[model samples]
Target: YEIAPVFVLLEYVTRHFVHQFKGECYFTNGTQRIRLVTRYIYNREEYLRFDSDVGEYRAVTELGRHSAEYYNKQYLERTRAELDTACRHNYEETEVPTSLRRLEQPNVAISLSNTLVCSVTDFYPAKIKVRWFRNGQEETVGVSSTQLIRNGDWTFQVLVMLEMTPHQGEVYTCHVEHPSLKSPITVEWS
Candidate 1:
């Protein structure tokens, strides 16, 4: 019992001596010594260094001025707890769901002008891509797509249309790409 208090006092005195030196913060475990260096910066560096070896509960720094009082061990421990709670929020994070289909009909608009529509629906985060490929070749002229429309439930929809025609038995593809899909969503029409 007396030895425990003496050991604690020796530890406290050792830490105080280490702090007075303003050298480093470290502890010995078994045969290894590990040091930790922590720095806090705000609007300005202030360039002040806290010389406490094992932290002083944010009382003061080497500049002899009150520092970030909230920047203490308790604050850090609470922040870590908050982070752990956030990690276990129980909300299942889901990827976006995309649907690609050929709108109206195909193979009927191949002369003068043809409007091929690809409607994408039911996805979150709103970032998507729809590219038209005519016979394995990318078509750039007269191709247009609508802006992402939010669908009330935090999802989105978009319309991508290609203004061109296709040959007989010709395979035209509307390639859709989004973060939700592992690979490109390809919809073909002849």
Candidate 2:
């Protein structure tokens, strides 16, 4: 089924040592667990990794080769099972839920004739719906949207723009739809 994709990361930290085990779990349609990818890093390099598709440890570097072989030989069962036990456990505990807020109001600028810019910011999952409305009806022609932009803090933003001429007593609305919203948000430009 078509659904938004989400992923959560699990990081294992040690005191002063750089040895780390990082796991990432991917989900689709909300709670459906799709896959898990885990990596063992030593001294800033990925030594071994376990992919849910393979269900075994694979080596990246030379040092990783030795450890990968050892893990496949001795710790095969445990390492394999950790993909689920560790990934799903941390996903439930550490997964961040989506947040919604109107960071800024939609604004109108005169670029050509009339340029309506709806800047939607600080959203997650990257799946958003933006619509332009003329008075109460939906507007389709001369509407454009930028690509989903990734922010440094893992949030997303996009600019949906409408190019149209304005009459004296007309109302234009910028409508936003996102997963984090219970009802759609509408901002009017009159």
Candidate 3:
């Protein structure tokens, strides 16, 4: 289960005027303690704050002092219950070996000299490796790769290119390794 430490609510009255209402919950793992901190700010100055553990609102300015006193007198128990309610609700809401959607066999694109580009896209778990092999031997020199590019759907793509001089009877292969694959992918370009 994952939990966020803070939640903010912003009210925009105009371009220059914005009010913020922030609420955050803290949990102590060792001693099993939970508390909620609620705060209101006008412009940039904090106006009022509430601590569930203290069971009262603490005022920062005169404007906050009046409202803080009113809230403590009228809604003391209710404000304190916010922490208990939020923590219980979160506990109740108890909650990828990813595979590539599309794998491109290294397409043999001839550029200035011989440029073999391997396209690997739509894969998950970002860590991936693409290598070039010539006649079953791994080729490292003049091999370039693109950083993993993320897709909108949380998948990734990469392009790896190998620059080489063509041989009459040689086999070039693109070797791809990813966690999602049962075995590494090999694409040949003769």
Candidate 4:
């Protein structure tokens, strides 16, 4: 049996113990709550009304949002400086592995109105380059790729798409680069 998703709604009311403010992440799931989330950033120090019941939850005063402001500037700047130092020193990491493929067959309609998908998954460092090429000349139109999605296992996946009308023996390619490969790997479909 599939586990039902636990519902969670968080809001804020002015924090003044009287005046109120609320929300962020206008991203909604089903379309029901249909209510809007007012604030996009939680920069102010306030009570974070959370689902103390993720299994059960704690109250506002005990929520973590109150001290979130402390993480704003100091930690952000320090981490930025650390990464800057790493890049300046030209350090390279050796922990990235990846695989690439083209999606077609039942996945592609074989018509000019269809799309070809290049999927790159199970990579590390979250750094990947996926480019689309046509006739080996490199084409850029109708290309869209997804943001890196991190799996709980710490690896990442990204999907890239190219819209096309199938032609006779036309070559479409997806090029991928990762630290683990001395050269980019190319996958092609006709």
Candidate 5:
């Protein structure tokens, strides 16, 4: 019958010495084999390589006494624990600040046209919403989209278009929100 073998090596290094451990296991049609190898080095010099093949052979027999179901469960539990540790160590959380800019042509007549640009740094998969207010009252007439651009720093940029009447003194605001921040960022332009 065919056999599948898995090998694993773990090495710990310190300033004075190095310790190494290896594990090898094989599963065949009706049996399994397991072995543990250990070695140590002192100051870059080899001290001992355990030559206990008899112990390894006995361990293989002992491991084989367990049912396949038990072995499978053990393998899965170890694998899950290792994976969880790796994920926790490698994961990082960062914060980004939101900024807004207006890109509109200055108008001197009774009509107003402008584009409001909003950007954020260190964010991902975010939802943005924009609103325009004139004298504290929400205006329903505006042109905008939920378009976003990635800046490669886990950040994003969104652009919204604004066109309105040229009042003597009118306040326009853009409101943006995401899952990371406690409150939304509001940008105002006159």
Candidate 6:
């Protein structure tokens, strides 16, 4: 004896108010009854702008969209509201994690007479760790610093600097690592 009620009212509310994105619905059944669940996944790119009292100011932008999730709250509320409801179960929700995609690695080569500067873009905050690696080993020989400029899209441009001599050939590399990514991004040049 399995029973599932059509939640047309809840569906309408979600379509009109909660989630503006397209989604899907599913159902599951146990020995005595059936359950319905609606899931919404939205990928959105938001721009954050800095403004002054007069008007708009400078803005930095990051690339790539972030993921958001919405569930059928009406269904859960109804289940809990029914004092006579027999089924007892726990509900859980999960969200998909984000990954890093390297957009560009600026050229690192420069004359020994001038300071060397390199910029990396399209990286997330928690994933942005920059270090210099020489001949496959990490190098801490000289003073180095990284500055993060936030882009409007939640991505960031990392400015990395290292003062070096011509002897430090093409073997010198910049390494960037993120938690979601498997390998750190490395940029090298003569």
Best by TM-score: 2
- Model 3 error, position 190 (Å): 0.8
lDDT of 4 by residue, 105-186 (tens): 1111112238888877776656677788899978768888777778767567777888888888899888887765667888
| Reference-based lDDT, residue 70, model 1 | 34
Model 5 misplaced regions, further than 4 Å: 1-122
Q: Write the per-residue lDDT of candidate 5 for residues 26-137, one digit (tens) a residue.
A: 2223123222233333344433332223322112332223322343443434433322232222221111122222121111111233554333334545454555566778
RMSD of 2: 7.7
Give the TM-score comparing model 4 with the true structure, all chains together.
0.44
After the best TM-score superposition of candidate 3, give how far the Cα of residue 9 lies from its true spot, in angstroms.
Answer: 6.4
Report the C-alpha lDDT of model 6 over 16-129, residue by residue, as the tens digit.
433322212222342233232222322342222211121221222342111111112223344333212322222112111222233333323322334556566665553466
Better of 2 and 4 by lDDT: 2
Model-by-model lDDT, in order? 0.48, 0.68, 0.69, 0.49, 0.40, 0.42
Predicted candidate 2 versus true structure: per-residue lDDT over 81-169, tens digit per residue: 65556555445544533222223332223222368788888876677788888979999698888887888776788888888777879
- RMSD versus native structure for model 1: 16.4
lDDT (C-alpha) at residue 37 in model 5: 35
Q: Which stretches of candidate 4 lie over 4 Å from their true place?
A: 1-113
The parts of candidate 1 lying over 4 Å away from their true place are 1-113
TM-scores for every predicted model: 0.41, 0.63, 0.49, 0.44, 0.37, 0.39
The pairs that clash in candidate 4 are: 13-20, 14-19, 14-20, 14-21, 52-56, 52-57, 52-58, 53-56, 53-57, 112-165
CA RMSD of all predictions: 16.4, 7.7, 8.9, 15.2, 18.2, 15.8
Measured on C-alpha atoms, candidate 3 has an lDDT of: 0.69
Worst window of 10 by summed lDDT in candidate 6: 63-72
What TM-score does candidate 5 reach?
A: 0.37
Q: Which segments of model 6 are wrong by more than 4 Å?
A: 1-113, 168-170
Poorest lDDT segment (10 consecutive residues) of candidate 4: 102-111
TM-score of 2: 0.63
